[model samples]
Target: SKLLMIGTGPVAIQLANICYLKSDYEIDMVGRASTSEKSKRLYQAYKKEKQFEVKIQNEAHQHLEGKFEINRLYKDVKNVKGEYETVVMACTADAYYDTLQQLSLETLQSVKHVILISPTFGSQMIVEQFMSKFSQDIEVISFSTYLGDTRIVDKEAPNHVLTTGVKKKLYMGSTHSNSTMCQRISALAEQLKIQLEVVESPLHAETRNSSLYVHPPLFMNDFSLKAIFEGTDVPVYVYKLFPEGPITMTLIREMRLMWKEMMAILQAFRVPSVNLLQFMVKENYPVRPETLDEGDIEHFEILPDILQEYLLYVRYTAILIDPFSQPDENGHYFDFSAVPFKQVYKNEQDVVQIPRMPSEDYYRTAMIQHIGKMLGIKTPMIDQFLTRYEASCQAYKDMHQDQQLSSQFNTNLFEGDKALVTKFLEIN
Candidate 1:
């Protein structure tokens, strides 16, 4: 089998490495063309090396290294001229629509499976709608999240990825809702040595995404959003910097409320309840040296009742010792403060690169909000965060009158499909 993996991010590189080395499949990578220095540097390196190095280190500090070589590198999908059995969408959730637009009907027809590596809410439905324009039978697979926590340490190095932890198991589901395709995917996952749990439907897989629960509170908070708008250079560690403080506790409170509302929405749809603690431990929780003693590391689990204390301890301890969490002379930790903020960057072509976090959270939270409305469940926390986030977006829009901000959250995707929305809302 041949796989056409999209995007050039760390996850895409990691997947390419595993597939090229562990599986019996040929691989190719395609990324959108960009004039950015980082993108250009990566493009040049790929053209020169024909391969990139990936390093996966486990919790026990064991290392797995591989050099992944693709059959071809394409700057744009239109430039890609090959038949691939699988298409892996490794880009952000917002990139899906644009990615689909880039693919021609011929390319879509040849793809047997389209896998979303880290899908947001309604990703499968959106992709299915787009793919239906070309073929009705193409299987759309959704992975609840990425297989590992990964980052590209060096863009100039192109392929040098630092994988902190690999998932023990990953959940996968297909839009088709049958066992045949699920079974086939299970075999492919085996080739990569990744445990695959096939679920009943893509909706099950989509709502299971930990990011839908984690990112909103962290990024949408008052401090983070304010810092971003002020153009402060302070680095915000997504997890480490804001742990255990009053602000963090407030954020966590909102997270819990939002999650409760989300789970209620899922329940209304008749999806089985997921263990929040276990899901956190398995999906988004990172085992950092700063946060865990040997015993703590060996036996870290959270009870629903003690979630607040557990989360505070986990986040506080982790950030306390993080090298990035090192405090300054003023006794303030400035490390890990490099969180993304809503900013206006206008290029010569009048193109703008707006902050992605707001729009991204808006989509996920809005979906949950809409579902809550349908089920007569109130989502006060979710609504509060979104209201603030929208204000932030509006501020950015007001300031950047000459610049265009990117907003990819399309409510129409769900609202237009009454039948699909009804199906999603149906339980049993």
Candidate 2:
């Protein structure tokens, strides 16, 4: 069988490495010519070498290497005439519509399965809407999140990737909710060595995303907001720095409320309960043993109320499992940080472009807010954070007339479409 992996980002590269290691499928990667110059250069390098290297660092700081070799690389999907049985869309959540548009009707018909690695709110619906244009029996598969934390270490060395940690497991679901498809996908996952837990539907798979809960508070908070508007140089670590002290506590409290609101909305929509904290610990977050007390251990073992469990989880796990830092002389590991707001600024375009946290979180929060409104559930914290974020963008816009703050969220999926909302709410 043949697989076509879309995009040239970290996730795309990582999955390519997995496929190359498996050596069971012929793989081809397609990326846009309009992508970053670094990506273009990387593509050129891959075409020359026919392979690239990935360096993976596990939780214990163990290093491993893998190489991804491709049968061919194409700049545009339309130019690629090969028929691929499986296609992995590893691009950003917001890029789904545009990316799908890039696919020729011929390419769409050639694909039998479409896998979205980190699908966010309403992603399957968006893809299905576009797929309606093609007369093909395509099964859409949605993974709750990306399998690992990966990045390109050097543009010059486009083949080399730096993966900090691989997620233990990820939830997956298909548009065609049937036993046969699930079994087939599970077999494919085994070949790739990815731990995929099959769920009932794509909607359930998307709801398993932890980023929607974890990201908004980090970037939309007062501290980060002040730093962004005032042009601070210090980078903030998403996990290590922000999720500590009083500020972190307040953020966790708000996150608990947000989760509660989300759960209520899900209940109203007749979805099954997914314990947030347990899900986080099992799939993404892990704390060091020394940091937690016996009571904390018990809570960690058996999840508690959202607030209590998350409070303990954040306090103990934030620094321990942070991907970006090393330990300091003071017996504290603090330097691992997220890309700061200053880095998000692009002088040439005069706008903070896509892939920035604030921009990404805006869409996620907006989706949650819209869903809550439909269910008569209030999301005060979500509203507050988004309102402040927009205000900050406006402030940036006012100060830098030449540069624009271009962050926005798309609400077309559920904003005013009663039928779509009703279908989304209906339990299968």
Candidate 3:
């Protein structure tokens, strides 16, 4: 079968490389000229060295050239582009929406399957919007790399190449919830040598894995020292937090608490743990190193489980027993990149009113919420910010209602060039 590998970023290139190397599927790369160079180079490099049969296309290259397929028009994708069976949107969420809007809905409905390889700030919204427009028969699946530790950058060789080192395992589920599309997508990934476990629904996987994990620490813990370290060298802190120190300590503790809560919810739902821990241990060797030296073993073994201690008393009681313990039906699930936002507002009743719907202000709001949560301070200000955010989204929607006649209305509202527009759309 033919596969359309979209996007040209590092992650997209990586996916293209893997598809080229492992799967028997024919591959075609499509990307915008503004964003497709890296992927072009990667495909070119692989072709030069490995002599693989892969086609590359970009908006500027004016159709496939030099034994490679390159298309200049982003909207030139017709209903019948050869015998391709699948399309993978490997670009950013905003870009994916833009491209998706350009393609004819009837044409998009022809593909057997579509995979979104990058994480979007509003992935669920994107899925909802796309699925609503396209026929129900077409299957859509979303995936992002699940490297353990969540470090920004690392010099040391990782313990595992793919799923290994991922202490927190990723789960794949669809909007349709318990459909076979999950398994089919998983199987497709397996064919490419990437093993992914399926969960009940995409939202479930999202709420469980990402929604509440990065909230407190990333947003909170902003001491003056923290700012210096973060501002001067952000990656250094990321490395230390994941690879060393109090941050990793906190993460493990909070993660365990979150997992336990999730397990209880699963058990209540009569769902199985699915041997998630074992799978994570095997795939994410970086977080769980394969062969540790005495010091490495001792360090991990002896490190104080501070988060465990803190969570066990009050937080655990609240999480397990509180009536509102479960995730908010509306707010709990978030796109992979917007996980932090979901975490901040989980169970938070107060709403903040912002001047505009989507602005960089959310970052500041998140920081405030984090501090409030960490310091046990009230977050009435954050609530105010949210109120403003909501208002802004309504205003944007009202403004665009007449001028913007688009099948991809959701994309126009949620996925855009402006950061504030993007942020407000998600919350709205």
Candidate 4:
């Protein structure tokens, strides 16, 4: 059987390494070598070496590192050929529809499963509706997120990658419950000692993504947009205090409002609500037990709205320092919140581009807002975020009349995807 993998980014390279080592199926990866200079370089490098290498930083996770070769590498989606039993999309959710639509009818007909390594809310609906024309029966699976942090340390070697960490647990859901692909993937995750929970449907697992609620408030605010679009004199981190970063009482309040709107959307679909604070402390990061009471964190869904905002603020304050890091002689611990913000930069063609933080955040939140509208739920907070992000794009375009810009600057993106979402929401 043949397995087709998409994209040429860090995540795609790392996942391809694992599949090459563990799976018996022949692998073929697709990259936009014809359009992107970076992708062209990766394809050329792989052609010379005829192999890819994956390495891990820590010794305990050495099992993740290995060197392997693929059966074939296509230069672009339009050039992809042959039939496959499974297709794994290692790229972002925004590209799912465009990529799948580019494949030939015969190629899509032979596919039995499509796995979304990282998907946002409503991703599966778009995939299922688009694929139904070619295949009568196909399983589309969604994952809460990628396996872990993977990157290319050496820019010169694009075929090789280093995985810094692995997730402790993951959630998966398929269009059809208890799918064969889910079981095989669960076994592989077990081999890596990672926990996998299979949910009822793709939308159920899609809601489990934390970005749908947190990213907008964190990245779409005035301070964040300025820091991202207009460069900062000194470095500003992503999760630091007021002067150091963007966390404040107002931001936390917006976060609570945004989460509340999301909860309403979940209620419409009958999906369970997520305890933001509890998930942050347990699934993501942990502060000391004394930092937050167990009852408040456990019953976050049942707490008063005002109290929920207060606790959420407290959670951010508690993590200003690394709570579990080893202290030195002066009791100094690692600066856990020192993630620097990325500013707009020009690509090789000297075309201006926005950083993925707010750009991708724009598309993601837009999808959420569209879903909420279809469910007859009002999302004022989400609307504010989209307005704030749009103004930044609008202002940037007017000032830089002489320069080129990427398609990301254009507003009203993903209208086709939105239409697909509307079809699903309206009929349901």
Candidate 5:
């Protein structure tokens, strides 16, 4: 079977290496540029390690190259011959959205399955939109790595490989709907020796919730730029700056709080508490806390307000807004009013709609504001950091909005078809 792998970054290259290790499938890497030097070196390393022939090709020659072809992105995939048995969109959400919008039904029909990797922060809305446009015959899945437990990166490996399906007790699912896609994707990962904990629906899989639970509190703990700047060691930063308090043990407490919040959210949605439980258990805690009598376990009853606010507002936007604009092909443009708020305290007036995904930009700003509102931390360093993050998103939004308005005014109805067409042609 043919597998089309898109993207040429570090993560994408890593995936290509793993896929190449399997002899059963043919592999291709697609990108605007032929692979980057880093990717090429990695490809060569994998070729030697796996003893497999992995070919990289451009779009025009991918089909001609053979069963597995790596081609530059097709502007219109309809006319491309040889349907993909499996299609992997391995880029960020913005690139994925652009690719999908340009995809042809003919190309889409050729694929039996589709896999989306990362862009993890807002995948549910995209999956829902995909189902609307494509025939139900095809399955789409999202995959995320939770290698936090391993020390491969000097203790940076995540503890879990979070995806949307369960294999041997782990559960994974798309936020858009429950589909066999989760099972199939999980099966592939399992075949590769990766363990998937659970398949969760979109409501339960909130990346924004996790991001806020981790980042803001960590950043806000330090008042001095020197204290913030010195946090080069990730684990040390994560362990000490965490909500637990005091300087040396702060990051650890933050991680604990993050895990706690994650567990609470997971419990709320009834997904098996895989990652959080793993954290507690790995940290020398009992897997099954025997009784409510334990004061430590009793503390779990109190949900931190920061975590609570994150789920309500920030998570709401990540779940609802980002994917709709950036990746949902069948998504209709509606006002943000479609979302129902769990917390009524947010200022509804200051909220304005942006025309694109805010994940890469708006996330940090929202996280700081939410933290400040909840924790009452006024660390100037964190506040300044938040300001920069907010400005980044605003710049993108402003530019996108201006272009949209300009396009509207320059449309045929307003500017006349002849003049508009001529103007458009000139620009092209």
Candidate 6:
């Protein structure tokens, strides 16, 4: 009768609103309200208005528009007290284990389905190993990624979020194949006017995420690391070309090599490999057909390495701005690539916290590298990304030895995750 939402960001607000409208369950949200201003302020804002709002930027996303009050708001995950049949995790992948561990055994015993909104490649396995002790059969579900881009409309009004866009399609999988929960989610996607595909398993679905294939190469490189750790003269954007951003001839080559190394791991799992080029042009973002050949894009998996690199570079060149956006009198399309890199900042405890870009990316990449090792697959390119990222971390620590730093600066931060993944592979 109850559904638990395990995050307090705009992502949580948007998804909780959908749970409120689309199901009969009493919605409840839990956050570590003491941890950060973002989580604490959201709790304060919700307490004042007693409602959360999701506003759609475009009329087409009206189905996702809603204003609703949940049954309760939990200030801390440990304080949450109720039996929830379903739990949707809106937090990052690294926190999944610690978050669930905070809940009571009695509460966990009541959960039948645990959903991972943005799991990495092996997220489900970690959850399964932890939950098996409490239940004989707890179905774990994973989505390729969240439905779309959601953000806070106002810092003060953290309870209200504006959804800028919805994905055209997303892939999902459950531990139980053809499970009723999977069917229900598919039906829900149809009502939201989003396409959904149920793959063979959660691992298969997780491997479909674009970030797993793209983020490490883009963020863990030398230029991007410099912008994030060592400040630049002017703002450097994430998507701009070399002088303005990190994308370069070397970056593209690394991106292709990383994908190939990942393919080897996927091959070991017997899961169908992702077609990187086609997925970029078709599923993620659109590029004008003139920029790429249909044959090259369609046969990307079988294309020559040089040809793939050429097409990838061409795709990046095409989308420096929103090509489909209406040009203004100044002859400019929307500046789609203006996202600024976030520099490391200090938290309330005065501990220096690194930005999520490469920080979160570090953990994600580490696990991928660890999994490759467990399978005895050589990942020289993946190893290089990790090396570059860790090198930056060490340099920052050395320069600022007196400052209290976040554990992200620790050597091999995702060691626990790597161990769990290794165990999962051994028993699997």
How well is each residue in 34-133 modelled by candidate 6, as lDDT tens digits?
A: 6777899989999999989999999999988899999989999999986899999999999998899899999999999999999988899888877877
Off by over 4 Å in 1: 34-37, 57-64, 81-83, 176-181, 184-194, 231-249, 281-359, 370-378, 400-428
Clashing pairs in 6: none
Cα lDDT of candidate 5 equals 0.39
Candidate 1 lDDT, 127-226, residue by residue in tens: 7766766676778889888877788776568667887876777888897776565776688677657677888767688877777877788778777677
Candidate 5 residue 144 Cα shift, in angstroms, is: 3.9
lDDT (C-alpha, whole model) for all candidates: 0.67, 0.67, 0.41, 0.88, 0.39, 0.89
* Cα shift from native, residue 156, model 2 (Å): 1.2
For model 4, the run of ten residues with the poorest summed lDDT: 419-428
Which window of 10 residues has the lowest lDDT sum in candidate 2?
409-418
- Superposition-based RMSD of candidate 3 using all C-alpha atoms, in angstroms: 15.1
Please provide, for model 5 over 1-428, each residue's C-alpha lDDT reduced to its tens digit, 9 standing for 90 to 100: 76767654444444554565543556655544231333344344433443222222323212111112233322122323455677777765444654554456765667666666654433434443453355555565555432222111211211111122222222244643555556555666566455564445533433423443444443334421123222223222223212222233333354455445444434543644533322222221222233212343334335464443332232223322223344356765333323211110112233333322223223333333333334343435445445543453344455545332212112112112223223322432
**Distance (Å) between predicted and true CA of 3, model 1?**
2.6
Clashes of each: 9, 3, 29, 0, 37, 0
Better of 4 and 6 by TM-score: 4
lDDT of candidate 6 at residue 127, scale 0 to 100: 88
lDDT of 4 by residue, 190-263 (tens): 88787888888888888787777788899999989999988688889889878889998899999999989988
> What is the Å distance of residue 345 in model 5 from its true position?
38
Model 3 ranges with Cα > 4 A deviation? 17-24, 35-85, 120-122, 144-169, 176-181, 188-195, 208-212, 219-236, 239-428
Better of 1 and 5 by lDDT: 1
lDDT of 3 at 126: 50
Candidate 2 residue 228 Cα shift, in angstroms, is 3.2
Model 2 collision count? 3
Winner by TM-score between candidate 6 and candidate 3 = 6
TM-score-better candidate, 3 vs 4: 4
